[PDB]
Amino acid sequence: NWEDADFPILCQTCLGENPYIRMTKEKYGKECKICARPFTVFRWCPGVRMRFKKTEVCQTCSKLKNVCQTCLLDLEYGLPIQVRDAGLSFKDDMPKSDVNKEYYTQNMEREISNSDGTRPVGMLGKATSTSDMLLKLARTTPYYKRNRPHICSFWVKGECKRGEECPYRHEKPTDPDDPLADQNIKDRYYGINDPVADKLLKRASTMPRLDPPEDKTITTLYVGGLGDTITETDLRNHFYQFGEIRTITVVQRQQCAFIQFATRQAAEVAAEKSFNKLIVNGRRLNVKWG
């Protein structure tokens, strides 16, 4: 089918830093880079020195995979699709071969048009269960360096006869001796071998995490960074969630708090939930084993 929708699905670092945006709507302008069925192309200018970005994929190919239509990054977290599927499950399995892709597209678009038109169709129930490591490397500030005109290919040959009037950049292109420079559109879409996603998951592997007990059954918790502006009667209230809490040794001369629970399971938990995440009394509460 065609698509024919109003107001595209965009993030905030592609839609520009101006709250006042002019965009044009073309009814069936291009085809999708994934679906190859034609859609409504929206085209705007992000800012002042930017590139005139436009939407690349359908409303449907962004409903299936919860991304922005031009940068193909997540709407909520802003990370590549392979990273978000790595920090979640992968149960979409969109077909890549031709006839199966258009058949699956027709049927999932029928499922979309047999619904409200507001939610991620299959990604919702798995989007309830969230806040993995992907929340701990999500970019806080907008990356406005994407919205930036291409390298002038006449200036690379030293023949840019426009000079100062050329809107294209006179600066270095990136070295092709780089994994970060292949980057197919469909490889970035389907979550297959995206090198940006490789570097983000590698950064992710390094990152701090809750760990297992050195010895069996030990529910002893070695808590560093307590501080003397807190009270131990509240800890219990913020801890009871887990189960009956075993031993609760308290030391304020090192500001370390040792804890004990019935089962080791609960102690692992309290690490997991607790490690590099929990803060109470506006003060970070750091945890270790033994």
């Binding site: 399995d93 077909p95 890549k96 071969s97 031709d98 006839v99 199966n100 058949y103 699956y104």
Partner: protein, 50 residues
């Protein structure tokens, strides 16, 4: 290879319908793949006797 369809058979499930799900959890259980045994297996063996 110069053809539109045809390579879609081994690559994936062709016109896949998911089995309808309800009233019983069936997310844990799985099936075991076939033994390869590529030192006895023949084209007649997969097909069965005529």
């Amino acid at each position: 290879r110069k053809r539109k369809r045809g390579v879609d058979y081994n690559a994936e499930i062709p016109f896949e319908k998911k089995p309808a799900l309800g009233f019983y959890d069936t997310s844990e259980e799985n099936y075991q793949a076939l033994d390869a045994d590529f030192r006895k297996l023949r084209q007649q063996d997969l097909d069965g006797e005529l």
